[PDB]
Design an enzyme around this catalytic site. Structure first.
Site, PDB file in Angstrom:
ATOM      1  N   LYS A   1      27.088  48.875  43.660  1.00 38.12           N
ATOM      2  CA  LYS A   1      28.001  47.817  43.231  1.00 38.12           C
ATOM      3  C   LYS A   1      27.121  46.572  43.404  1.00 38.12           C
ATOM      4  O   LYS A   1      26.538  46.370  44.471  1.00 38.12           O
ATOM      5  CB  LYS A   1      29.209  47.750  44.142  1.00 38.12           C
ATOM      6  CG  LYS A   1      30.271  46.779  43.623  1.00 38.12           C
ATOM      7  CD  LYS A   1      31.544  46.888  44.473  1.00 38.12           C
ATOM      8  CE  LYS A   1      32.700  46.103  43.882  1.00 38.12           C
ATOM      9  NZ  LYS A   1      32.898  44.788  44.536  1.00 38.12           N
TER      10      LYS A   1
ATOM     11  N   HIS B   1      42.600  41.989  44.094  1.00 33.27           N
ATOM     12  CA  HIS B   1      41.254  41.650  43.622  1.00 33.27           C
ATOM     13  C   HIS B   1      40.727  40.510  44.456  1.00 33.27           C
ATOM     14  O   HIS B   1      41.507  39.665  44.911  1.00 33.27           O
ATOM     15  CB  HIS B   1      41.265  41.178  42.163  1.00 33.27           C
ATOM     16  CG  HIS B   1      41.559  42.256  41.180  1.00 33.27           C
ATOM     17  ND1 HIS B   1      42.575  42.165  40.247  1.00 33.27           N
ATOM     18  CD2 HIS B   1      40.993  43.476  41.008  1.00 33.27           C
ATOM     19  CE1 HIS B   1      42.627  43.288  39.551  1.00 33.27           C
ATOM     20  NE2 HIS B   1      41.681  44.101  39.992  1.00 33.27           N
ATOM     21  N   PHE B   2      39.422  40.505  44.710  1.00 34.18           N
ATOM     22  CA  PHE B   2      38.821  39.378  45.419  1.00 34.18           C
ATOM     23  C   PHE B   2      38.181  38.510  44.306  1.00 34.18           C
ATOM     24  O   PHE B   2      37.241  38.949  43.619  1.00 34.18           O
ATOM     25  CB  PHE B   2      37.728  39.852  46.398  1.00 34.18           C
ATOM     26  CG  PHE B   2      37.226  38.771  47.328  1.00 34.18           C
ATOM     27  CD1 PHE B   2      36.193  37.911  46.931  1.00 34.18           C
ATOM     28  CD2 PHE B   2      37.811  38.591  48.585  1.00 34.18           C
ATOM     29  CE1 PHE B   2      35.749  36.879  47.767  1.00 34.18           C
ATOM     30  CE2 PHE B   2      37.365  37.549  49.455  1.00 34.18           C
ATOM     31  CZ  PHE B   2      36.332  36.688  49.043  1.00 34.18           C
ATOM     32  N   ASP B   3      38.689  37.285  44.125  1.00 28.58           N
ATOM     33  CA  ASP B   3      38.165  36.416  43.049  1.00 28.58           C
ATOM     34  C   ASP B   3      36.953  35.556  43.408  1.00 28.58           C
ATOM     35  O   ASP B   3      35.983  35.492  42.639  1.00 28.58           O
ATOM     36  CB  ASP B   3      39.292  35.487  42.565  1.00 28.58           C
ATOM     37  CG  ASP B   3      39.085  35.022  41.137  1.00 28.58           C
ATOM     38  OD1 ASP B   3      38.917  35.894  40.284  1.00 28.58           O
ATOM     39  OD2 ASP B   3      39.100  33.799  40.869  1.00 28.58           O
TER      40      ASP B   3
ATOM     41  N   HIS C   1      37.142  45.341  50.463  1.00 30.67           N
ATOM     42  CA  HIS C   1      37.047  44.006  51.045  1.00 30.67           C
ATOM     43  C   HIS C   1      37.432  43.715  52.463  1.00 30.67           C
ATOM     44  O   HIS C   1      37.221  42.597  52.923  1.00 30.67           O
ATOM     45  CB  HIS C   1      37.808  43.054  50.111  1.00 30.67           C
ATOM     46  CG  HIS C   1      37.300  43.085  48.715  1.00 30.67           C
ATOM     47  ND1 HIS C   1      36.005  42.721  48.408  1.00 30.67           N
ATOM     48  CD2 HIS C   1      37.871  43.465  47.543  1.00 30.67           C
ATOM     49  CE1 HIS C   1      35.796  42.871  47.111  1.00 30.67           C
ATOM     50  NE2 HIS C   1      36.919  43.319  46.562  1.00 30.67           N
TER      51      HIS C   1
HETATM   52 CL   LIG Z   1      33.598  40.554  45.718  1.00 34.41          CL
END
Ligand SMILES: [Cl-]
Ligand SMILES: [Cl-]
Ligand SMILES: [Cl-]
Ligand SMILES: [Cl-]
Length: 124
Positions: free
Chosen positions: A41, A119-121, A12
């Site tokens: 992905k 984590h990217f929410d 990210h």
């Molecule tokens: Cl993402």
């Protein structure tokens, strides 16, 4: 194995550009960051701010994560981000991505000591 914090950085962070170059930004970055190695992905967001500013979000606004966990934080300010998502023509090993640049607040789940993004929410 990759630590959770390092996986978040690799997936990210893009502190080297202020915003997505061209329409080809995602194809290049998804490949460069090894997110198309064995499969494409499907969705991935890159944040164009310093690692420090993204980490600082972990001490900003505490909000619920989509999955209901309570370790998510929403950055107080908007940030430059690029969302990368596979297009209909994408098919491994020929992944193909649509690049959408935006300025939005980021929401990340944080964990550990130091307490950093894992984590990217979502972006708002
Ligand atoms: Cl993402
Ligand atoms: Cl680490
Ligand atoms: Cl550079
Ligand atoms: Cl922008």
């Amino acid at each position: 194995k990759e630590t959770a914090a390092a996986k978040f950085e690799r997936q990210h962070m893009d502190s080297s550009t202020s915003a997505a170059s061209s329409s080809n930004y995602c194809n290049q970055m998804m490949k460069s960051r090894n997110l198309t190695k064995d499969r494409c992905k499907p969705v991935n967001t890159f944040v164009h701010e310093s690692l420090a500013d993204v980490q600082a979000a972990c001490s900003q606004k505490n909000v619920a994560c989509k999955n209901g966990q309570t370790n998510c934080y929403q950055s107080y300010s908007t940030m430059s981000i690029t969302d990368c998502r596979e297009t209909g023509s994408s098919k491994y090993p020929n992944c193909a991505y649509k690049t959408t640049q935006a300025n939005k607040h980021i929401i990340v789940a944080c964990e550990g000591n130091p307490y950093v993004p894992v984590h990217f929410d979502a972006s708002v």
